[PDB]
C-alpha cells in the first residue's frame, strides 16, 4: 500500500523498463495478458505497489513510458509483455532528440513534458499512499537524459517529500557509445544531484564484465544487461512487496545510506550470479552470498570499491535465513576490510531481510554501496567534458537549442564540487 510510480525514459530506459516490468510480472505471477496466474497469495499481497486492478482480474503497471521517437516503444509494445501497459501511458513525440540533451530538455522536451506530467499526476493521484517515483534512463543520450532530468525536476517541484529513485546508465569508461556522452552526462548529473534523492549508477561495460566473468556468457545482448538491471530494481523493492523478518523500505535505505544530501550516488550489485556450469557446484550459503556481494567484480558500476572507501552499504537479503548469520557475516566483512570502510561511522552496513526469495533461488541479496570510488567515474567524465568543452566540439548543437554556454560551466563546477565532496569524505579522519 506504499505505491511506486515507475517511469522509463529514452530507448535504454524504455528497454530496461520493459525488462523490469516483465521480471516483476513473472515474480507476481502476471501473464502478458494481465491476469494473475501465480497460485500463491504472497504474489497478490502487495501487488498494488506496482500495479492497479482493471475491471476484471487484469493488472496494469503503474508505469509511464517516455520517448521523443515512437520506434522504441513500438518495439516495447511488440515485445512479449508490451500489452500489459495502459496505452494512455505511452507518451511520444515525433522527432527524436539527436542524442541532444538540449533538444530533450528545452526544445522538444518542453512540449511533451506537459503530457508527461499529466500522466504522472494521474498515476500518482490514484495511489493510496505514494512511496515515490523510480525513473530508469541512460546518461549520455538526448531524449533519455534530458527528458528524464526535466521530469525529475518537475516531480521534485510537485512532490518534494516523496522519494525519488533513479537508475541511470552512466556512459561506460573504456568504450563510449556516442560522442556527446560526456556532455549529456555532465548536464544530467548536475540535475540529478539537485533533484534526485537516490541514484544508482550503472555502466554497460561493467555489466559486460560481470556477465562474461560470472555468468560466463560469450555473446550477451542488451537483453542480458537489462535482465541484470531488472533483477537489481526488483530486489531493491522486494521488502515493500513481501513480508520480511527485518523489513526496510526505500526511505529507510535512503536514510541509512545517505549521510549528506549530495552524496546519494550508489553502486549496486546482485547476488548470487552463477554460471550455468557451476550452478550445481555452488553452495547457497549466507557467507557465500556475502563473499560474492563484496567482490568488486560484482559491482555493476565501472568504478571499483577498492580505490575508494565505503561511506555506507545496504544489503537487502531474501530468503529464510539466520539474522545472526547475516549480521555476523557483514560485521566480519567490516572488521576484515576496515581499511575500505569509513572510520567516522561505527557501522557502515544496513542489513535488511525479506522472507520471500526470488523465484527459483533459495537465497539472494542485493547490495547498494555508497562509496567514494564513484569519484573516479565522475572524474573521468569530467576529463572528457573538459577536453571537448575547451575546443567547443559539437557545442553548437546545444547552443542552437537555446542553452547558454554558462550552463555547461555551471554543471561541470557542480560535478567537480561533488567529486570534492567524495574525496574529502574519503580522506576525512575522525576527530
Amino acid at each position: 500500500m506504499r505505491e511506486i510510480v515507475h517511469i522509463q525514459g529514452g530507448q535504454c530506459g524504455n528497454q530496461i523498463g520493459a525488462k523490469f516490468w516483465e521480471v516483476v510480472s513473472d515474480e507476481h505471477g502476471i501473464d502478458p495478458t494481465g491476469t494473475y496466474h501465480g497460485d500463491s497469495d504472497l504474489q497478490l499481497e502487495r501487488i498494488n505497489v506496482y500495479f492497479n486492478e482493471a475491471t476484471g482480474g487484469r493488472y496494469v503497471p503503474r508505469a509511464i513510458l517516455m520517448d521523443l521517437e515512437p520506434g522504441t516503444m513500438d518495439s516495447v509494445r511488440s515485445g512479449p509483455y508490451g500489452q500489459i501497459f495502459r496505452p494512455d501511458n505511452f507518451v511520444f513525440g515525433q522527432t527524436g532528440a539527436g542524442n541532444n540533451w538540449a533538444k530533450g530538455h528545452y526544445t522538444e522536451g518542453a512540449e511533451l513534458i506537459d503530457s508527461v506530467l499529466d500522466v504522472v499526476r494521474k498515476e500518482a493521484e490514484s495511489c493510496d499512499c505514494l512511496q515515490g517515483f523510480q525513473v530508469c534512463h541512460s546518461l549520455g543520450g538526448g531524449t533519455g537524459s534530458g527528458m528524464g532530468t526535466l521530469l525529475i525536476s518537475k516531480i521534485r517541484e510537485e512532490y518534494p517529500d516523496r522519494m525519488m529513485l533513479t537508475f541511470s546508465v552512466v556512459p561506460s569508461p573504456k568504450v563510449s557509445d556516442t560522442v556527446v556522452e560526456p556532455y549529456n552526462a555532465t548536464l544530467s548529473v548536475h540535475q540529478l544531484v539537485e533533484n534526485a534523492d537516490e541514484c544508482m549508477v550503472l555502466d554497460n561495460e561493467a555489466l559486460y564484465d560481470i556477465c562474461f566473468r560470472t555468468l560466463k556468457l560469450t555473446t550477451p545482448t542488451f537483453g542480458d544487461l537489462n535482465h541484470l538491471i531488472s533483477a537489481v530494481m526488483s530486489g531493491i523493492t522486494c521488502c515493500l512487496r513481501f513480508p520480511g523478518q527485518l523489513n526496510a523500505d526505500l526511505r529507510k535505505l535512503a536514510v541509512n545510506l545517505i549521510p549528506f544530501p549530495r552524496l546519494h550516488f550508489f553502486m549496486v550489485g546482485f547476488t548470487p550470479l552463477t554460471s550455468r556450469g557451476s550452478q550445481q557446484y555452488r553452495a547457497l550459503t549466507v557467507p557465500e552470498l556475502t563473499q560474492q556481494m563484496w567482490d568488486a567484480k560484482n559491482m555493476m558500476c565501472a568504478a571499483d570499491p577498492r580505490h575508494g572507501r565505503y561511506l555506507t552499504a545496504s544489503a537487502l537479503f531474501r530468503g529464510r535465513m539466520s539474522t545472526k548469520e547475516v549480521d555476523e557475516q557483514m560485521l566480519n566483512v567490516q572488521n576484515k576490510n576496515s581499511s575500505y570502510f569509513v572510520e567516522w561511522i561505527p557501522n557502515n552496513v544496513k542489513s535488511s531481510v525479506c522472507d520471500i526469495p526470488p523465484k527459483g533461488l533459495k537465497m539472494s541479496a542485493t547490495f547498494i554501496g555508497n562509496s567514494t570510488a564513484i569519484q573516479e567515474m565522475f572524474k573521468r567524465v569530467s576529463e572528457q567534458f573538459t577536453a571537448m568543452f575547451r575546443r567547443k566540439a559539437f557545442l553548437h548543437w546545444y547552443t542552437g537549442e537555446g542553452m547558454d554556454e554558462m550552463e555547461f560551466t555551471e554543471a561541470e563546477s557542480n560535478m567537480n564540487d561533488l567529486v570534492s565532496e567524495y574525496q574529502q569524505y574519503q580522506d576525512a579522519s575522525a576527530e
Binding site: 518495439s75 511488440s78 515485445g79 512479449p80 562474461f212 560469450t218 555473446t219 550477451p220 545482448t221 537483453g223
Partner: protein, 33 residues
Amino acid sequence: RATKQRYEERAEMYDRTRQPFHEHQLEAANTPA
C-alpha cells in the same frame, strides 16, 4: 518481434557454438583467453 527474436536467437546460438568462434578467445576481448 520477429526481428528482435531473430537477433537474440542468433546471438544465443553463436554463444552455444562458441562454447568467428574464436573471438571469445581474443587477448583484447578477455585477458584469460
